[PDB]
């Protein structure tokens, strides 16, 4: 079992990070109150349906549990509680996660590729938090289809934690083995030795015929999906928690450095990569958002003795204060999302400059790990 070697660039500019201000309990504080006030105006608006993936015109849709992004709702209703203890959010999040379990049970719109992030911030969640039993049910069970249907796409690193949750629970080495096992398979098929994410085959490998399921998500075969970069930079340190290995944080430190490199001045990312300041191109602030969240968790096991820590510490607060100061929602309206301007899909127009809801969970959950010490749900 080993990884393949990547180009791990050094820090462009180091500077440009560590002369940041480091974020303040006040300022993550008020960052957290802000996006709250607008959790709470929404769940009046969702009750105990959905949003949509992405917004229209900065404003969600309400869907039923349909989707692959339904979770991340969830998610986020268990972040607020992490934060005021308020029962109602336990209760309305409590809600969705029975009817996580009857979609389960009832294998409605299900693709293994979307379990990962599904079950694990809404029900994984719950069990993290007061050890509901209905929640562990419908994770295991979300563990077991997970199980068969492998029985290869960055996003996978992700999914995968689910099965190092399943292995936790039962002791079963099985879970464990598919999941070690895909984090390799990914790393070494997903990831291009200059530590960029790519695709696997969009096409059959039997007839050349176009797929369902995922069409197109980079500009190009030559570009750098924003997105499937910060897959990388969070999935590999939360891998890393389960199987200990070295060369993870290698890879981790190539697919971040990578990113660093390519952030425009206020260091929130173009949706490609290959897009900075002066092409007019749309952010994602999802991707942004995810790589905070990646970096922050690598950091609690990169060795004091790694000449970028610092580095990564100051970077990850300038992407943040930056998301805080200049993505955030400002307009107290129903339906608005708790941060602007990521894109869903380029090349099918999908949600492209809106809101997304995994963009509003993962920046929440940024917050919430900054001003915390907040046990994982992954």
């Given at each position: 079992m080993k990884i393949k070697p990547v180009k791990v660039e050094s820090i462009e500019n180091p500077k440009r990070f560590l002369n940041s201000r480091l974020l303040t309990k006040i300022e993550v504080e008020e960052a957290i109150e802000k996006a709250l006030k607008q959790l709470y105006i929404n769940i009046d608006y969702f009750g105990e349906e959905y949003p949509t993936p992405a917004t229209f015109n900065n404003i969600y849709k309400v869907m039923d549990?349909?989707?692959?992004?339904?979770?991340f709702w969830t998610g986020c209703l268990w972040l607020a509680y992490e934060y005021n203890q308020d029962k109602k959010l336990k209760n309305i999040a409590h809600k969705n996660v029975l009817s996580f379990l009857n979609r389960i049970n009832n294998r409605i719109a299900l693709d293994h590729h979307d379990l990962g992030f599904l079950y694990t911030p809404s029900c994984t969640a719950e069990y993290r938090i007061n050890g509901d039993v209905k929640a562990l049910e419908a994770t295991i069970k979300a563990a077991d289809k997970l199980m068969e249907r492998y029985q290869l796409i960055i996003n996978c690193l992700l999914n995968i934690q689910l099965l190092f949750f399943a292995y936790e629970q039962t002791g079963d080495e099985k879970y464990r083995q598919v999941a070690v096992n895909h984090f390799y398979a990914s790393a070494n098929n997903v990831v291009r030795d200059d530590s960029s994410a790519f695709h696997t085959f969009?096409?059959?490998?039997?007839?050349?015929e176009p797929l369902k399921g995922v069409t197109r998500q980079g500009y190009?075969?030559?570009?750098?999906?924003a997105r499937g970069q910060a897959w990388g930079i969070y999935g590999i340190p939360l891998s890393y928690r389960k199987m200990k290995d070295y060369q993870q944080i290698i890879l981790f430190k190539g697919m971040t450095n990578y990113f660093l490199n390519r952030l425009p001045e206020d260091k929130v990312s173009y949706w490609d990569l290959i897009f900075t300041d002066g092409s007019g191109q749309p952010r994602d602030t999802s991707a942004t958002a995810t790589a905070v969240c990646g970096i922050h968790e690598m950091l609690k096991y990169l060795p004091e003795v790694d000449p970028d820590k610092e580095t990564y510490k100051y970077a990850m607060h300038t992407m943040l204060r930056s998301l805080i100061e200049?993505?955030?929602?400002?307009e107290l309206i129903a339906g608005r999302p708790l941060l602007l301007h990521g894109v869903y899909s380029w090349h099918s127009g999908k949600g492209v400059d809106e809101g997304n809801i995994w963009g509003d969970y993962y920046y929440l959950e940024a917050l919430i790990r900054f001003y915390k010490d907040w046990e994982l749900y992954w």
């Open positions: 549990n349909t989707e692959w992004t339904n979770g969009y096409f059959d490998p039997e007839t050349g190009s075969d030559e570009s750098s999906w200049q993505y955030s929602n400002n």
